């Protein structure tokens, strides 16, 4: 039937326009630029080979990109401005209190609640809203260092967690830092 055939062909070709934009996503000029992220920053002294949009990994799994690199000329410090994820880098609703009471197990601990004001409850009360938002999965003591991928050309960033009781905020600065070394470290200690 006229109508039938027409409409059919129509939608059919139309699709080709529909899959065009899903094919246009892979061009990198439109679509898939990271959602629900935020920003941290750190300070180095050596950033050898590091380029923008390099990888950031938690223990072997990627969590963001590196976007702005600068050098501070007054005391010769590098500073990277990178964006993490906000879905694989943060607790949801249930996981907060499930670790906030594990944080309060450390906050109202026998070593800490007894040494501070042990007749108050404000320090157990103020810690909940302060750790409600502006919080990460990264510990308050955790060092970031430039690893060497490709084992011949690269330098993705590695965030090593561990220890501690509290965490870092959604916009703060990681202070425990370790800039990379070079082949000139590989020779100088070897010589």
């Amino acid at each position: 039937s006229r109508t039938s055939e027409l409409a059919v062909g129509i939608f059919v070709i139309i699709f080709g326009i529909a899959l065009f934009f899903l094919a246009m996503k892979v061009s990198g000029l439109v679509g898939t630029n990271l959602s629900d992220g935020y920003t941290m920053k750190a300070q180095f002294d050596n950033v050898n080979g590091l380029k923008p949009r390099a990888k950031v990994t938690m223990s072997g799994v990627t969590i963001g990109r590196v976007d702005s690199i600068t050098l501070d000329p007054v005391t010769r410090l590098a500073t990277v401005t990178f964006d993490l994820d906000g879905k694989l880098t943060s607790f949801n609703a249930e996981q907060l209190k499930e670790v906030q009471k594990n944080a309060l197990d450390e906050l109202r601990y026998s070593s800490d609640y007894t040494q501070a004001t042990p007749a108050q409850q404000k320090t157990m009360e103020q810690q909940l809203i302060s750790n409600m938002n502006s919080i990460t999965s990264i510990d308050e003591d955790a060092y970031i260092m430039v690893a060497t991928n490709g084992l011949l050309g690269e330098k993705y960033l590695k965030i090593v967690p561990g220890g501690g009781l509290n965490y870092l905020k959604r916009g703060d600065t990681i202070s425990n830092t370790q800039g990379t070394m070079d082949l000139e470290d590989l020779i100088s200690k070897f010589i």
Binding site: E5, L6, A7, G9, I10, V12, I13
Partner: protein, 256 residues
């Protein structure tokens, strides 16, 4: 609004047109050719193949001169000038000598099967033949189609042979590469039954879809000598879409 239903339904007389060409194709091969068929069959080889021979040597000589020229200069920096003979062989044999051999063949003889039959359509050369009484599907189609099938694997081997021997000329005569590591790089990595034989089985179905379209699109075309060129591209367009569209199924069935 009527353009999108004019652009609509344009597949349908095309898919009905393609469905005709299948119904033609059985009617050519499912009959035994008579005496006098082999004599025109030789002349079609003289027409299609022997005339096509002078081209694919030069483009055969070229691509080996390029592919062994540039990858080595980045590869020499680590440890490897001995794997030069492998990378030239295994990309010509399993990848390009099926593909780039047809696109030069669809260029020359993929046209001259159409315009020679676009010849006999405009001056009613075709129609007079039926009227005197032959059938051109036996007469002017079947010796054309059977040369087109045969002559392409007869060329794409010829192509890649000068293709490899071309890259030797840049290597040992100008880049000073070792001859023994050149060839024994190939002999360890290029088996016969998995590469050169399966470089032929690619080149047969690259020869059938290239030459059957170029026969049909010259037969069932209107004799208008404007549309003899729009029919000309639909040889080349539907060949190059399908000679590239059926590399990707043939690469996957062989390996991967």
């Amino acid at each position: 609004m009527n353009t999108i239903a004019w652009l609509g339904r344009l597949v349908i007389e095309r898919i009905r047109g393609i469905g005709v060409a299948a119904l033609m194709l059985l009617q050519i091969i499912f009959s035994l050719p008579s005496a006098g068929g082999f004599g025109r069959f030789v002349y079609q080889m003289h027409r299609v193949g022997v005339m096509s021979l002078l081209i694919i040597t030069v483009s055969g000589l070229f691509i080996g001169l390029v592919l062994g020229l540039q990858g080595y200069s980045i590869l020499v920096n680590v440890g490897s000038e001995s794997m030069l003979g492998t990378m030239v062989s295994l990309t010509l044999l399993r990848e390009l000598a099926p593909v780039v051999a047809a696109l030069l063949f669809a260029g020359r003889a993929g046209s001259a099967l159409t315009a020679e039959i676009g010849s006999m359509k405009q001056s009613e050369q075709l129609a007079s033949m039926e009227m005197i009484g032959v059938d051109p599907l036996k007469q002017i189609v079947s010796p054309r189609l059977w040369a087109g099938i045969v002559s392409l694997p007869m060329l794409t081997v010829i192509f890649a042979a000068i293709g490899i021997v071309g890259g030797k000329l840049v290597g040992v005569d100008f880049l000073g590469v070792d001859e023994g590591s050149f060839w024994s790089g190939m002999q360890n990595n290029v088996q016969f039954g998995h590469d050169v034989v399966n470089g032929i089985i690619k080149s047969i179905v690259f020869a059938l879809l290239c030459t059957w379209i170029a026969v049909f699109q010259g037969y069932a075309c209107d004799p208008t000598p404007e549309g003899i060129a729009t029919a000309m591209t639909r040889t080349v367009v539907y060949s190059s879409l399908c000679v590239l569209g059926f590399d990707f199924v043939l690469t996957a069935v062989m390996f991967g």
